[PDB]
Amino acid sequence: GLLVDDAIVVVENVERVMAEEGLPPKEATRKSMGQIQGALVGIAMVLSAV
Amino acid sequence: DKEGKGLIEATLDAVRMRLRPILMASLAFILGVMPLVISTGAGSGAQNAV
Amino acid sequence: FGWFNRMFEKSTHHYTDSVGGILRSTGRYLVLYLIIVVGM
């Protein structure tokens, strides 16, 4: 599970900025990982931290 | 911090657009573990424990 | 169609404004959480 679920967030966040913001291309993806920057790296450390 | 404020009224807009992930990633996890809980009572009882 | 309609109404009020409801009070969950912590 876990690993799929982290792949889910990045897949969905593009599918959510396409619906909300109204932008269709790579530039729509781009800024998603702007909020999911430490939500990938920092959470990995605490995932490992248990 | 990096966006435009909100003590109570920003927690909402946070919890207003991502319950899709936190439900479907949580739902695919439930069903992905469903073959472990039962479905098999011959292979291993360790699948039940996990 | 509207299969998506079935949880968009659950997102608003039945969730988002319901979330407003619990922190509109807060205090009631100071000991209810402690009932879960000591309960577990």
A9 touches chain B (CB under 8 A): yes
Angstrom distances, CA of residue B40 to CA of B18, B31, B32, B35: 34, 14, 14, 7
Nearest Cα to Cα of residue C38 among B48, B12, C30, C19: C30
- What residues contact residue A49 under an 8 Å CB cut-off, 6+ apart? none
CA distance linking residue B15 with residue A17, whole number of Å = 15
Angstrom distances, CA of residue A29 to CA of A22, B21, B34, B41: 12, 16, 33, 45
| Among B2, B16, B20, B33, the residue to mutate for chain A (most A Cβ within 10 A) | B20
What resolution in angstrom units was achieved for this structure?
3.4
B19, C19: Cβ pair inside 8 Å? no
Structure solved via: X-ray
Determine the Cα angle at C28 with ends C22 and C33, to 5°: 95
Q: For residue A12, what are its two tokens?
A: 């969905």
CA distance linking residue B25 with residue A8, whole number of Å = 7
A3 touches chain B (CB under 8 A): no
CB atoms within 10 A of CB A13: 22
Terminal alpha carbon distance of chain B: 41
Q: For residue C6, what are its two tokens?
A: 């079935």
Q: For residue A28, what are its two tokens?
A: 């729509």
CA distance linking residue A43 with residue A20, whole number of Å = 26
B18 touches chain C (CB under 8 A): no
Nearest Cα to Cα of residue A6 among A45, A44, A32: A44
Q: For residue B24, what are its two tokens?
A: 């479907």
Q: For residue A46, what are its two tokens?
A: 């605490």
